[PDB]
Amino acid sequence: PEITLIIFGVIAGVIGTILLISYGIRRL
């Protein structure tokens, strides 16, 4: 049931982390 939430979390986590790094290197 939380399968939806888990898959969401992984994809969002991966994308979020990448976008945060990208933002970080632009501004540093």
List of residues 6+ apart from 18 with CB closer than 8 A: none
| Residue entry with tokens 């990448």 | 18
Q: How many CB atoms lie within 10 A of CB 2?
A: 8
Six-digit token string for 1: 């049931």
Determined by X-ray
Q: Is 2 helix (H, G, I), strand (E, B) or coil?
A: coil
